[PDB]
Amino acid sequence: SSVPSQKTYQGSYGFRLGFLHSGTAKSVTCTYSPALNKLFCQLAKTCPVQLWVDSTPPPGTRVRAMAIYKQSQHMTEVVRRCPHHERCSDSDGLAPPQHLIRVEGNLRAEYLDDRNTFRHSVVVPCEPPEVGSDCTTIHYNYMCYSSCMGGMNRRPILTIITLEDSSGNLLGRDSFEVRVCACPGRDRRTEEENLRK
Ligand SMILES: *c1nc(N)c(C#N)nc1C#N
Ligand SMILES: *c1nc(N)c(C#N)nc1C#N
Numbered sequence: 001s002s003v004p005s006q007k008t009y010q011g012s013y014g015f016r017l018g019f020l021h022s023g024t025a026k027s028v029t030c031t032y033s034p035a036l037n038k039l040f041c042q043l044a045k046t047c048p049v050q051l052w053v054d055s056t057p058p059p060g061t062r063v064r065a066m067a068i069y070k071q072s073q074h075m076t077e078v079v080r081r082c083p084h085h086e087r088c089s090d091s092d093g094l095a096p097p098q099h100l101i102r103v104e105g106n107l108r109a110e111y112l113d114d115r116n117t118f119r120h121s122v123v124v125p126c127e128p129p130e131v132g133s134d135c136t137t138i139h140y141n142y143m144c145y146s147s148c149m150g151g152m153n154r155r156p157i158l159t160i161i162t163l164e165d166s167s168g169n170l171l172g173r174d175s176f177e178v179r180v181c182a183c184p185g186r187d188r189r190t191e192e193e194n195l196r197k
């Protein structure tokens, strides 16, 4: 299965991701670590990702999200939900049950099973910032734990976000590592202290 590029590429529109500050409390459902470039989140909980461009992209620009495995041994294997989570009765009517990454609160979200690579992705219309903001925000959900055997199985994943034209040509790309886990605040503090070692 063809390996998608993970190379950062701001492109003509200066495309880049951002995250707002969230903290490492016990109650946190979703927290981003700059030092790790890693997002820590709970299963099926809102993950706000901020989109930035230097200049407005043409109408019909889209934003696609795709997971891949981080380690090179596994980057050819397709990231999918585990055999147990794909049988849950949890489809919002848009997301197919095998897809790890969902978009929350956007009826124009489209889900793709690539016919040649078999990789999953979810894609939405790029939209201008809502009233009184300077970022466009997309809300993602991750539908499998990182520990789920027969799925990610403790293998780290990257989420790749690509800005695309209406034909799906690349306009820009950014990415971040993801851990879906029960206590994200605790796990973020854990991994951050290790990197200081
Ligand atoms: C998914 N969906 C349901 N309803 C249950 C239960 N009980 N477990 C999973 C999983 N994994
Ligand atoms: C996507 N689409 C539009 N129209 C705008 C604006 N303004 N920003 C993005 C992004 N990111």
Ligand SMILES: [Zn+2]
Pocket (backbone or CB within 6 Å): 081, 082, 083, 084, 085, 143, 144, 145, 148, 151
């Ligand atoms: Zn699972």
